[PDB]
Every structure is written in C-alpha cells, then in structure tokens.
Amino acid sequence: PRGYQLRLVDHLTKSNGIVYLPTGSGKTFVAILVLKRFSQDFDKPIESGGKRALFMCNTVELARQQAMAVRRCTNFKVGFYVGEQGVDDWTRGMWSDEIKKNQVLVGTAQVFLDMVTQTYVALSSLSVVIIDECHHGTGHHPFREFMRLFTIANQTKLPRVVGLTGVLIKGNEITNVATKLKELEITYRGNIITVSDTKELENVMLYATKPTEVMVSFPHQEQVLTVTRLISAEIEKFYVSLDLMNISKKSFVKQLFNDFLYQMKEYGIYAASIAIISLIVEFDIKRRQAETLSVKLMHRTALTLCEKIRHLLVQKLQDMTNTEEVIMNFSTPKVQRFLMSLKVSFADKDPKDICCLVFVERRYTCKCIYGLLLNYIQSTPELRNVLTPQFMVGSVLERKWQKSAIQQFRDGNANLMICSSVLEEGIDVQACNHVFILDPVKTFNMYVQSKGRARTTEAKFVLFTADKEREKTIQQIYQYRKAHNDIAEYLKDRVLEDIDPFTNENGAVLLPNNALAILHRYCQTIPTDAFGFVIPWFHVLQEDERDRIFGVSAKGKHVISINMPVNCMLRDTIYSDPMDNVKTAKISAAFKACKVLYSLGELNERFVPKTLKERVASIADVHFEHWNKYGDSVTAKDRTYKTECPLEFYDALPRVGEICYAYEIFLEPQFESCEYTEHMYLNLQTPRNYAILLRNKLPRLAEMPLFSNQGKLHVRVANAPLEVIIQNSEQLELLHQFHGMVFRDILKIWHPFFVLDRRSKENSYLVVPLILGAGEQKCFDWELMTNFRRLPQSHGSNVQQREQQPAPRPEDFEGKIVTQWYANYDKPMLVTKVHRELTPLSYMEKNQQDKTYYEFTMSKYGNRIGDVVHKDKFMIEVRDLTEQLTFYVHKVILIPELCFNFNFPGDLWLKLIFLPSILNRMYFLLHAEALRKRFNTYLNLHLLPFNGTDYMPRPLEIDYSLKRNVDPLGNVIPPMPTKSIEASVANLEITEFENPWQKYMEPVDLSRNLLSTYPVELDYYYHFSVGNVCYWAKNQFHMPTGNIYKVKPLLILQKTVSKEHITPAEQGEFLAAITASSAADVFDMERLEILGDSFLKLSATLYLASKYSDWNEGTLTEVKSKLVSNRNLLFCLIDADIPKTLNTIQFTPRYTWLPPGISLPHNVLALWRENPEFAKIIGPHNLRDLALGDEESLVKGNCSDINYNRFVEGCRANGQSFYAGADFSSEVNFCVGLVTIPNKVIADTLEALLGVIVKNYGLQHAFKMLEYFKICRADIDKPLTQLLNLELGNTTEIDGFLINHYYLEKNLGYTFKDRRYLLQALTHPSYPTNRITGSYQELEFIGDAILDFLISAYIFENNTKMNPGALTDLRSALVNNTTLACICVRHRLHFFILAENAKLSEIISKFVNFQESQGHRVTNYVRILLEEADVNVDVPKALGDVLEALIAAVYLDCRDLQRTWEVIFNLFEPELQEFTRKVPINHIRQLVEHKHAKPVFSMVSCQFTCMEKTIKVYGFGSNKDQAKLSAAKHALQQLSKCDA
Amino acid sequence: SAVSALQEFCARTQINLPTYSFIPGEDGGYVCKVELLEIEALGNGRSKRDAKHLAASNILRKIQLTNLNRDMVKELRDYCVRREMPLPCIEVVQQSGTPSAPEFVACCSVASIVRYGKSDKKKDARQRAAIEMLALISSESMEELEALRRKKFTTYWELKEAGHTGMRLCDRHNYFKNFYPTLKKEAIEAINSDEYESSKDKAMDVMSSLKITPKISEVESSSLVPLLSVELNCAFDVVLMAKETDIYDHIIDYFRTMLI
RNA sequence: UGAGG
RNA sequence: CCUCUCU
RNA sequence: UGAGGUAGUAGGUUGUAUAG
RNA sequence: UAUACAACCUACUACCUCUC
C-alpha cells in the first residue's frame, strides 16, 4: 500500500488535523509534504492571489532547526524570525517587505501572534499554519491565542491548521485525558490523525499486549559512611572559596561537582569512583580551553579537588581488599538489588537470547553505571561472556560514537543498553526481552515509552523502587495505566484507516475484479527506479465535482477517478460508471481503465501485461529484417571473410601492344646528413628509382611516412603516369622475371610453394627499374633487367682461382652491394666508399691498433680464408643493410678480394627494402579512396570543387600517442611480499566518508574507556577536537562563485549549420577508419570510433523518439541497444560488402604475405576452391614439402603430376598423424586470400566510417549515411536528414509547480520560453499532481544522447594528445550518473525536483550533505559510492536523470545545438579541466594497480590485503561483471578507510 | 633510488661516474659531498646511506634545474619513559615495490595513537614513523628533583635492564604515595608532631621534607581576609586556594590525605 | 510573559 | 513564591 | 639468444668496535 | 636500539665485452 506518511499528507490536504506519531523522523517529511501541497499560490504577490505559509515553534532552537530543515528539503524562500533579531522592534512597512521577499515564515508563536494582531499580516493571506509541538496549545499559551484569532475572522478564507505532536499530553498531566484531548481538538479545529500500530510504524499508545510488570523494592539500609561526609565538607569548602574568586564559568564548575554528589548519594562509593574520573576529564579539557589565566586557575583547583576525591573513594575501596566483592559490598542497595537481579535473570543464558534496556534519569549516570556494569561483568565468571554493556544518551565525534553504540545493540553485538530517561522523544531500539527502570519514573511519557519497548508478552518490565515510596509509586504507575488505556480508547476512532466482463475479439475474458490486479501488474512493467513501483491513485469524486462530470446519473451513486502513473500511456483521468457501492465503483474504474489500455495494446490476448520480448518481436521485421538472411533473429566469437584486392590492382598485369602505366615511387629522407645517416640521405635521393607498372590507372595517393632505422622518410607516388607500350612478349617476360628476382633474392619473401602468377586475376602488377636514359622522361632499364634475371650465388673462390683472376678494381665497387663468403652467411652490405689510401697492410684506423688489417682477418679466420693475395689495393668501406621488411612503428673497412661482388646498383637495394611496406600502404590507401569516392557520391558532394577530380590528397598523419611497444630489432610486439593477518567487514555508510580523517587518526572514546585510558590519549582527544590534527539573507539556491577544484563554437556544429565550413573527406581519414589496432601501424580507428559511436547513439535515440513517440524509456532503451548492438552493425557492414577491404593483420612480409604477381600453384589452388572436402586438411607442413623449382616455379604455372600426387597423399595422410588438429586455418589463410576478423573490429569500423562523415561533413549529411547502412529505415513521410528538427515531443497552471523558477533558470544559464518542458523535466513518476505533462524518463532518453554526443565532440577536437584508450575513460567518467548527480547538486537543481518518495528524499538529503562536506566536487569517494546501476543505494539516479532531462528540455525549446552546448559547457567546464589533467580509471584497474593490496577475485568475493588485514567483501549483482564491480567498490571503500 | 638514478644518468650521458665524499660532520651525522662532472653538490644525514641518498637528490635537482642527525626511535622511547607513557611499538607492517627499490610502511603506536612512516629502507621507515609520533606526543633539571623525590627510570636502557605499563589517568592520584619511603615516613612524623608553634611552620616542614617549594600568590577576590593560591612545583600540578588563615591548614591536610 | 510545581 | 520557556 | 665482468640498490646473516 | 668496518648469501638495476 501507500506510505503511512503519504496517507497522512493527503488527509491533512483534505482537512485540518493534529498529526500524532510517537516514532520520530516521519513528522519532518509530513510537514514538508503538507507545506508543498499548499504552495500553489506562494509565488504570486500578497496583493494579487498571494498566499504565504507559517511554521511556529515553542523554542528558538527548534525554530532554527525547522527553518534549516525547510531550507534543505524545499525550493521556497524561508525567513527565520525570532526574538534575537528584535522582531518586536518592527514596523508594518518592514513586515510587508519581509512577507514580499519570503514565502515561508519560520519562527516562534510569540512573534507571529503580535504580527497577526497588529494586523501586519492577515489570516486570509496565509495558506497553511504548521504548529510544531502543538501539545503546548492548552492554556493561555500563544498557540491557543493565535487559534482564537481564527474565531473572529473572515470565516471564508481561513488557512489550513496542521498540528504535529510527538507527545499528546504534557508531562505528568493525566487527570482527564479524554477531556484534555477533546479540548486540544477544539483548540486546533482538527481531529487527531494517528497511524495504527503496524510494521510500517509502531504506535506506543495503540498496542494491546503488556509485559509482566514486576515491582522490586530495595531496603533503605541507610548506614552512612564517613568518606562521603569528608568529601561533602571538602566540596563545600571549595564552593565557599570559588564564589569569592573574581574572574569555562563558575556555574559549570558548580554543575559538574553537584552531579558527582548525586552519583555518590544515589549509586554508592564504587560508582562514585568511576564518575569522578569523568569530572577529571571534563575539568582538564576546560582548563586547556581557557583564554584568561584566572579561569585556568579555577579549573586547575577544581581538578586538584577531583584528584583528592578520587583518592579518598579509592582508599575506602582498598580498605576492604574491581572484584565483584568490592562492588557489591561498597554500593547503594538500589544498585545491589539491580546487580543481583541482573545475575538471576541472565545466568548462563545464550548471549543471542538476551536483549534488555536499563533506563536511568541523568545523562552522566549512564557513564557511571556503564563503568560499574562492565567491571562487575568482567569480574563474575558466570555473567561474563553472557552480557555486553553499552550506553546511550536520549561533538561530531560524540554523535558518531553514539550512532555506532546504537548500531552495536541492533545487530546483537551489545546485549544490554543503559539509556538516559526518554524525555521528549522515544528510543530507537528493537523490542527488549527485559526492561529494568533503575531510576524512579517521573513522567507519563517515560512510563509509556519504556513499557512500549517490552513488546513481547513474555518480556519482564522490572522497576526498582524504595520501600518508603513503594505505596506512592504503585498509585503513579496505576494512574498512568488507567490514563494510557483512556488515550487508547480515544485514539481508536482517530486511526488513519454485476459488471459485464469484456470479451476480446479473439475469445478471451477480462473479469473486472482481476482488473485491479491487472493494473498493478502493468505498473510493475513500466520503467521504475529502486525506490519502488508507482501504483495508480484512486480519488472519490466530491459531490460538487460530480456536477461537472455527470448530471442526473451522478445522483444517489458514487464515482471513483483512477489516475495511472505519469509514465504510462493512460495520462487521462478515467472516471468510473456511477454505481451505488464505493467498493464496486473501484471495480468499475479499474475495469474501464484496463479496457482503455487494451485498445492502446499494452495487454496480450489473455489480458496479461505485454513483456519486452513481445514488444521487440513486433519491431523485428520493420528494422531487423537483414538479420534473418544471416541465420540469426533479433528474437532469441569471430567470422572468416575473403579478401578482395582494390579494383585498380585486379586484372592489372600489363599486356603486349596495350598502353601501360608506370607510377614512379619517390623516397625523400626527412632527416639531415651526419655520419650515421649520410649513406641513407644520398642513396634515397638518387635520380634512379623504381615504378609500379600496371594496366589500370591509379588515383592520386597521399604521402606516407616510413620510419627507417636512421630516421623518418616520406614516400610519394607520382600523380602523372609514365605511358609505355610493350613491343613483344620477351620484354614482358624480362619484367616478370626481374620482379620475381627482387622478391625471391633481394627480400627473401619467397616460399617453396610460390609460383610466378601469369594469370591476371588478382594483385597482378609488376615493379620496374627506371633510369634517366632519355633527356626528360625516365626510360625503363632493360639492360639491368636482362643482366639480373637471378641474383648470383656466393660460390666464394679457390685459393688458386683467387690468385689468377684480376679481382680488385677501384671503380667496380663504387656503389654495388657486396657480401663476405666467410662469417656472415649471405649478409648483403653496401660499399658506401672505397678508401684509396688504405691497404690490407695499413695500420688499423680502429683505436684498437692491430697494425695491418691482414693480421685480424687471418687471426679471426685463418682456416676459412687464404692469406690475401693482393696486398696493395684500396680497402672497401661497408655499411650494413638491415634485415627488417616492416618500417612503421617509429663501418667495417673489409678487404675487397675477400668479398663476393653482387653487381646490383645498390641505389636500388635500399629502396627495394622499403618496397614491401609501401605496397601494403598503397593496397589499403587504394581501398580508402574507393570508400571515399563511394560515400561522397551517395551524399552528392562529389561535384564540390575540393571533393571533385581536382581533389589533392593530404599527407597521412601519425597519431603520436599510440603506445606501439617494439620488440628488439624493430619487430612490433603483439616485487616484495609480506605476511598479513585475516579478517572480515561491514559496508561503510556515506556518513563515514563525510568525516575528513582516516580511521587510525580517530581519537579514542574517553567516555566508554574511563579506567583504561592514559593521559597521552586525553591530550590527543583535545588537540584533535581543536582541529590541530584533521546565512538567513542568502537563499538555498546560491552558488559559491570560486574554483571548485563566450564558449568557443564546436566545429562539428559550425559545419552542420553552414555549408561554407565543410572541408573534404580525406583518403588518410578513411585509411584510419579501416585500420584496426591489431594492424600495429602508426594510425588506427579507435578515435573515430568514439565520435562515431556517440553520433550513432544520438541518431538512434532521435530516430526512435520521433518514430515511436508514445513508448516508455524501457522499451526505447532496449530497442536502441539492439539497433546499436555489435551484431546489428556486424550484419549491416557485411551487407555493405566493406569487411573484405579491412586492415586487420600485422605486416610480416616473410611468414604471412603473398607478394604481387606470385601465388600458390594454379593446380593446388584450384583443388582448394573446387573441393571444400580437402580444404580443411591442407596444412603448412604439407605445402612446404611441394618444393617445386626451375620450370614449375617460373615458366610453367602448375605443379608437376608427381608433385601433385605426392602433395594430395601427404595431406590426406596428415589425418592419421600428430597434426590431426586441423586448426591449420590461421597459417594457410594468407595463401588463399581469407582473413578471420573478430566481430568487434567490424562494428568499430562501421562507427569509424560514420565518424569520418560526422567530422568533415556535419550531422545532417551523416544522418543520410545511416539510411545507406540500413540502420534506420526512413519512413516516406519524414526524411532521415531532418531528424534534428523532427518533433521529438494554463501558464499559471504550469507556474504553480515551478515556484522560484528564476533561480533554476539563472543556475542552468538558460531561460525557458515554454516552461511545459521545464515542468516535464523536473517531474518524477511518483509525483501524482502533474497531469499537464509526462515524466523526466521520456526527456532523459533524449538528453543522455545529446549530452554524450556534445561532450564526445569536444573531447575529440580539444584532447587530440590522449591515447584513444584514455579518451574513452574521460568520456565514461564525464557521462557517469554520479558525475551528473554531483553537477545537479552543485547547481542547486535538486530542490526543484517534484517527487513524493520518502526513501528518495532521505537518500537525496544524505547525498547533498556528503557533497557539501566534500566541497561540491567529484572526488574518488563519490565514484566508489554504491549507485542504482550497481544495485541499499546511496547515489540516487534521479539527480543525474533530472540534469539530462533539463539538457534535453533546453534543446527542445531552443532547437539549437550551439545554445545547448553553451549550457552544457558552462555546467561541465570544471569537470572537463580536472578530468583532462587527471583522467580517472576503472575500479578494477585501481584495485589491481594499488601498490599494497593484491586483489583476489572469486556473488563475486574479493580477498585483499589492507595494512596487515586480509578482508573478503562480497559483491551482489544481477550480472557477474556487476557483482565483480560491486566487490571492487566495497574493497576500494575499505582501502579508503584504512589507508596509510 | 636517487643514487641509482644519478648512476644511470651518468651511464646514459656517457660521462664520468659520480665520486662520493663522506666526512664525519657535526653532531652525530656524516655529510656527503657529491662530486659530479662540471658541478659540485652537498647533502648531509644521520647515516652514510642516508647522507648519500640526500646528496643524490640535491645534485639531481640542480642537473634538471630533511634528515635528523640522531636515533629518533631511541629518543622517542626515552621521552615516553620520562613522561610515563605506554612504551612505543614501531614495526614494519608492509613491503611493496620492485626488489631493487622497494617501499616499506611501518606503524608506530603509543597506546592507541598510531602515525605511519613510509620509506625505501626498513630502518628509515621506522625512524620516519618515530619522528611523526614524537611531534604529535610533544604537542630539564626538574627531572633531577623528580628523581630524588621518587624512583624513576628517565631513559630506556635503564628500563630495558630492570624490566613500564604507563600511568593510567585513573591511577595518577597515587603520585604522593609513590614518593620514596624515607621521605614519606619523615613528612608523616612531621605532620603528626605538634611541637611546631605555628601551622605555617608545620606546612613548610612537611613540604620541605617532600622537596616541594611552595608558590604562594595573590588571587584577586572580593573578600576582606585575603584569598591566596598555593601553587606547587611537581608533575601532579597541585594548586590550592583558601583564605589566609585556612591556607596553611589545607596544605597540611592535602599532604596528610595523599601521603597516607 | 506563558506553562508546570 | 520557584523551575523551565518566552519577549 | 646465451655467457662473463664492472658499478649500484634492497633484504637477510655473521664477526668486531662504538655509543645508548 | 642505532652507528662504523669487513665477509657471506639472496633478489634486482644500469653499463660494457664476447657470441648468436
């Protein structure tokens, strides 16, 4: 059912009344809710339909506390008017100005009484009057006098009166309860409204069961000791000496000493010894807290008397001998009887069984009895390990320590509670099996409250009394009982307490009775927060209201209106059919509302609420049709994709007599000349180059950056082809042979299964040398090609052959490539220069003088090489050529005779080393322009001057932030422990974090540990309290105006609004969009993925909001998740035929690359494609064995019959072998042009491609692309492009809910033209009064998307220098509900939310107090706090959702994404700056990167070591990841508590 | 570590390695002069390792462009023994980081008050904890007078030999009772005796026996017979106030009761 | 000044 | 007449 | 890649001397 | 409990040489 609180609030709305609830913490909320219900006319001036509210209190302290409660829990200006401000000294004029400015007036009864009498304010102007502590009405009290002003008044316009009373009757006034309560009801013109005793609230007066009352009488036994007389004489001498001193005051000193004397009379010598220690502590604290010397002297002498009294009491104790005997013998008979009673009642009973409360009158008695009890318990080996004492009193530290003590009792750690007398308010403790009132009862409230704690009928209520007062106390208790029963009788009657069934077109039945249940089930399905479900609200139409709705029919019958939650489709009131019985009238309202719902749908054939699965199945064909063709359904790993070369490279093998195109490749070293880089600088810039010869023309390509071992260089492909026509077949044979020579010999890429490929099917083009043979044009180098069909082998030389041939000539080795037959095997090296001066005999230039070089070469390899034959020739200077074939992740003076001379130019050998890398970048750059041209055409931007045929590509840009870790030699790579003890823990409250000290720094309780404390600990308690270790003119909505820790236009929005700012899509951006992270290249797609993902979410949100306007956020969120899911984008991109052209493998040219113009033998390759049966079996081992050579590898293209049969047999035999694994797919995939790509890289590509369109073209053009990818099926009526301006979607009526909307609008930084959007944004599903608009939930769906895109666009453009991994973390942190909740609290927008949930209000107040403590800034403590998503909760989701709804409402009103940006930036600028300097990380990442805590993760349970304690905390979450995150959050909380 | 980093920087720059000069220095602390190529630096600490790791920090800071000289653990223990406070427990409770340069956290707990010191060496971290605690606990011939008045260790090695719990706040009242037996019996035979003509003479004799020099001062009061404040020079900080006539009987009474 | 004693 | 509260 | 050497850092141990 | 000197052991860091 509804809250006891919300049922009270409605009654008080209909009629005047005296709200009575013994149990506390409910009246504040009830007062706040009754105040807001009478706040409709607050804003209007008092001249024109204006009303103001009053809050009168008996005391200044209570008036102040209520004034602040109303300031913290409401959005209405509050004015505190009490005596201390000289209100008596005011004028009619001043009072009129005060009632104009303020809206609620909080004060004391005396202030307002004069105000209404002097006619400064009138009863008619006021709207509600709330009397806190209204039991004070009786007599001539100003509360009663104010109500008498209500007898002589308009009698038409009289304000509602609400009386909140904790205690119905004043202390010890029980003569005639009935007459007194009747007089109280006559005084306040309203019946007392209480709540029946229930689980929700317990009423002490309306309970029937009574415990077994026991009267234990204790003997006088007045044997007077002399120690008490001596102490008394000494204290009175002190009193005489103190009054005379002329001066943390004398009164305080008298107070404490008199209280000790009370403890010594009432509780005996042993208890007094425990209590003098308390005085010693308090007099020591005050001596330190003394400004002037005179006071310090007074406190020092008081302390010295305390030390003397401590001694006299202690010696009396020792004369007898903390033993039981010392305590019992030397104590008062009252205490003796209580201790004896304690022993008999709790003797060896199970500890979890006993729960008892001992009640004392004074607050210091608690401490002195707690000490006595703890020592007695330690002493008695029977009552030890049976009872645990604890005390409570009915400063930050004092409140914190009391809260801890009460929580100890509730969880059963502490069996006994010593409570100070109840006084004004009851005790928050569970039903106690034994209640023992140690100190004589003096009040009726005390008796009722104490007895009410012994709830169980078996519980014993013992009250200890004097023999002399026995007869008197019996009467007082008996009169209280008679009185209590009389209050019970009076409050018993004040307690807050046919139809034709519808037949479906398909046969079904909807009986009306089932309909109330059916409506409740439907309400459960609607999107709901943790705080609870919202049930429909029924209201019996007033007789006067019945007139408008119905005429003759509404006579002699009743009508019930049903209002469904504001989230549901039925936002219209459904008045029932006029019927005789109120009970039937509800069965009619429910039946009618259910029938209306069925028409709208929202119900199955059997009238069962429609599930999410059924809702999505309906939208399946409209949107997710392309899923079915891939054997998948939206209702109820990785994939392999064939690779297809660019169309420019397909069928590009040159022919004979047909024009061919040679594109020259220019390498330009972007490094200067110094000895290390001299050879590279000159050799790269040599006029001789090489060219990509092919039949198809090539597009303009971008300059690409390659990082050599000596520095960086730029590779450029010539825009202007060189057109050459081949004369015959011999020239083409030379071309292909030289191409094969380059890859086989110079680059060692050849495999034993590679055959030159003369069929022009795929990746068929050649590489040709060029010389400046002609004056201007560079002729093809036929001479070089004829000369080097195959590179010469290093035969070495015979010692005699050496002697014969004239091997050494200076000119021959000017620039060639040479290798040494000895040592380095086939290591080719470049002759940089040949020193003419140096000779084998020359002294080694090397600072290590070995004299003649002839010495070292012979010494190193005497056996390997004969002594050099020619002793007088130039020495070659060589520089090694690196054996690395991938180039994008950022001096031996040998003897000539000994080196085999390859006659290759050597200007070309380096350039050809970079060729494999250049070809793999040309391959993907060609695909990139294919995708560029394809998308510009669909957008019809192809004809634009910059995007047209005149388009010049821009040099590729290097992301300088990618980690790109490098293994040695340029390959890209794909502590101390200590022992600790074991423990466990309980979840930390938000309140604990508010305190600014670590747990270890907290001072000990001197109060609960009086005998074990040292003077050192007392010094610490004082200095910590000093802080040496750790308002009525300003509105609630005021921002502090300082650093918490003209907005520049976003370029994307500028490109969207204006055509002029559009810049061309670039080939470079498209290469980044296709290049995955695995490619291990300088650029990737992880950044465009961010902008693209944000756009896709923004566009899917706007599309679903426009197409299906009348859905709940639940269904829209679910359908949006399916639209943006990895599976949907996978299927869309696969349908788009783009995933074949993707860069997703690391470039190893030696193991996994099939070079252009060469392939597997046509025979084997055909076997693979024609026969899928044998495809699986073929493995790398089988292919290597082919070893075809000579004719089969070059001139012929098919493996020989013998080889073919051998291959086939070997592979099928492989089934019966060690290699039966058949996971051979990865190794042989490159051989047949297949690439396995993870399903995530495909969706990341689709988003990256959207991102390239969003960045360069703008939102409008990007929307058209979604139709291309078939993500959004655009309806004929509404264009996809106009999604932004599509309709996503009484002044006094709206402004009634929005009271101080001026301050909301000032803090937001935007003024709303239409406030309907503002009211919708602030409304909450629970709010039952707003029938104009819907809830935040609808606007929140739109706001989350808008905010995410706008923030993502900012982080993308501004924060270029962050690893794409951080730009994700930054985005996640900024958009988190916690971050939004903090900004909502900081900007003071929490006050304007419209809800009626008690839990929600409770948690919002706690979170606002915590944030105010922190300083309105997003700290780690807020991030670790539990949130609604993690799944009680201390971070409400409503605070962030309201901020998102306000951001949506700003856009909906303005219809400008630049104004919405300006608002968002002014709100988030502090967060943006802070999170850019220090980006926060995941909770799992924090826990695993913590230096001292090694996380062990199992309802996932994390065992971590924190400062010598191994604590395991369990995380409960619906999902395994959600449970792990909860465990990590609970852990991080414990680490934050006990840190170093 | 600082030394390791300076060591590695020299290797990387391909320059001369640092030369370290340690002298005995002032008080008990050595001073370390780092000699580096083209620069000179200074850093002094309690131990040679401590001085070296400070020298290193100072020179390293000038290239890019405190250490007490006593045993603070021992000093804190001596201070606690002197003031009668529960003896400190300093224990390394957490080791974490690379075995080449680790991080050690050590707790120091005088009674319930804990302060943490963290460093790169087990000993340095203990010293760090001890220093932090001493400052918090803190915020000389008297101890000679208090030694004659009552048996007291006044240093840790004297205590370690004999083998304190610490005076609880509840048990501070026994201060006069714990005075040396010879002094007490005499001050009692002085109190019980009535040979003295004046109570002023008795009061002075009993206080003189206990070696307490009284501080009689003028307390401002609205009374004909002067109100005087008798202050005492003892750890207990006894302070009494009475009228002139009663001042000397109250001294006698306090002493009798407390001495009993 | 109002309530209680 | 006193306590508490109020002005 | 493996092996060896030099300088350092941190822990533990042992023995001597010193202060406390 | 610190300090100074010498030895042993363990874990690690920088550099160098040789080899692959």
Author numbering:
A (entry chain A): 8 to 24, 25A, 26 to 254, 272 to 345, 354 to 426, 436 to 538, 554 to 581, 582A, ...
B (entry chain B): 5 to 69, 90 to 163, 188 to 211, 215 to 311
Task: Please quote the authors directly.
To reconstitute the Dicer-2–R2D2–siRNA complex in the pre-loading state, we mixed the purified Dicer-2–R2D2 heterodimer with the let-7 siRNA duplex, and then purified the ternary complex on a gel-filtration column. The Dicer-2–R2D2–siRNA structure revealed two RNA duplex molecules: one bound to the helicase domain of Dicer-2 and the other bound to R2D2. By contrast, the R2D2-bound RNA duplex (except for nucleotides g21 and p21) was well resolved in the density map, enabling us to unambiguously model the guide and passenger strands. These observations indicate that the RNA molecules bound to Dicer-2 and R2D2 represent a dsRNA substrate at the initial recognition state in the dicing process and an siRNA product at the strand-selection state in the loading process, respectively. By contrast, RBD1 becomes ordered and interacts with RBD2 in the Dicer-2–R2D2–siRNA structure, indicating a structural change in R2D2 upon siRNA binding. The present structure revealed that R2D2 fixes the siRNA duplex in a defined orientation. By contrast, the unstable end (nucleotides g1–4 and p16–20, containing a U–U pair) is not recognized by either the 3′- or 5′-pocket of Dicer-2, and instead is exposed to the solvent. Notably, the 1-nt 3′-overhang at the siRNA stable end is anchored by the RBD2 and CTD of R2D2.
The Dicer-2–R2D2 heterodimer has critical roles in both siRNA production and siRNA loading onto Ago2.
